[PDB]
Amino acid sequence: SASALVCLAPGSEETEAVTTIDLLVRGGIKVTTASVASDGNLAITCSRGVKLLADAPLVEVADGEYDVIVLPGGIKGAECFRDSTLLVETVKQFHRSGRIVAAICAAPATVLVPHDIFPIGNMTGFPTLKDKIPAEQWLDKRVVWDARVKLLTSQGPGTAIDFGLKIIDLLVGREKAHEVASQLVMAAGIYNYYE
Amino acid sequence: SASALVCLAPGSEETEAVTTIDLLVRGGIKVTTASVASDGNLAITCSRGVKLLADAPLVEVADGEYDVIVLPGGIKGAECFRDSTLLVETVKQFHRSGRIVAAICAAPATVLVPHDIFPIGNMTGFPTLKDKIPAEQWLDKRVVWDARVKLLTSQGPGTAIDFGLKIIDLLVGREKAHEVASQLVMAAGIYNYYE
Numbered sequence A, B: 001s002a003s004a005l006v007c008l009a010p011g012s013e014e015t016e017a018v019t020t021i022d023l024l025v026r027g028g029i030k031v032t033t034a035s036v037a038s039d040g041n042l043a044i045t046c047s048r049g050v051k052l053l054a055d056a057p058l059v060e061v062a063d064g065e066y067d068v069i070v071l072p073g074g075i076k077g078a079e080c081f082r083d084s085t086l087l088v089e090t091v092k093q094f095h096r097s098g099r100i101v102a103a104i105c106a107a108p109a110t111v112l113v114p115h116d117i118f119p120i121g122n123m124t125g126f127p128t129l130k131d132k133i134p135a136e137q138w139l140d141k142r143v144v145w146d147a148r149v150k151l152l153t154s155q156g157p158g159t160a161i162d163f164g165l166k167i168i169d170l171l172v173g174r175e176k177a178h179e180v181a182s183q184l185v186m187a188a189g190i191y192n193y194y195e
């Protein structure tokens, strides 16, 4: 089965993280949540106060063979990711071993740009944090998939469905992405993978 | 000053619950989460495995001064709600005291219909459970607000933003609902409270 490592830190955006996890599970992807920047503590207080329990500390799962690493946004959670040497090295290792990096909202600008992980990749993120993404790299689009570098980015809490569906499409295929989309009662405007 | 009691059970739909909580907090609404687990456990495993911590057992907060009681869906979470005499009594008390009941996905058909809490009024819910709503009550709308009985219902994980925004409208007003919506990068098919 395909698998995903979803990272969580104090201040992660809970709608982004939880919507993504839920959709991936609906897609038949095995999801492990990892606590970042918590010295092993699994209880994570998210950006609006939602409290989640992660499965494991990052240091215990970072070398697993997951197909994708997912970085939720949330201002402070993304800062924790940026300032975690283990998180940054893990992202780099996923990329160099041919796997997918997926990041939403503040995570592209806060994590990927300062560490120069994808120096010429195309990416999006939260629109009013546009200035923090190099102008030549920026696209203002609900989801961006840069197939060349296997970088998936997305914009905000309201694009979390679009983000999760594209992960499903990439790891388990279009038909499964459509099946999941069909379970949700999605808003007009969001791509449902029927075509 | 407005406040919301968001109920949680084993098997609740985590995207519905968490998206709603996040939006209400963004709207300046005080949120308390209440576990309806039969043993009072607060560490809830949701329908796709997300582990969410409730603030309090329902018995400790049911008599509180909340403007709305929120029932997330999730097949098994809604069954837990239906089968909890305290939950059902609390919903009835919110309604009889002139407060709002808000329910999404399976919660209308599983909780509200069998207990006949709203014998008259329009409601929606998850479309595969349409035949579990009395035909004279059913509408196929992303959100249904029946002000005559102060009943707010909605359809599924993908309508959680619409649902949360309508709670904001009902507790705080259109201006705040538009403010919150404007934060989210939400899809064009979701009403944004701007005219």
Ligand SMILES: [Cl-]
Binding pocket: A035, A036, A037, A038, A039, A040, A057, A058, A059, A060
């Ligand atoms: Cl760790």
Ligand SMILES: [Cl-]
Binding pocket: A117, A118, A119, A120, A121, A149
């Ligand atoms: Cl690059």
Ligand SMILES: [Mg+2]
Binding pocket: A119, A134
């Ligand atoms: Mg550069």
Ligand SMILES: [Mg+2]
Binding pocket: B119, B134
């Ligand atoms: Mg009847």
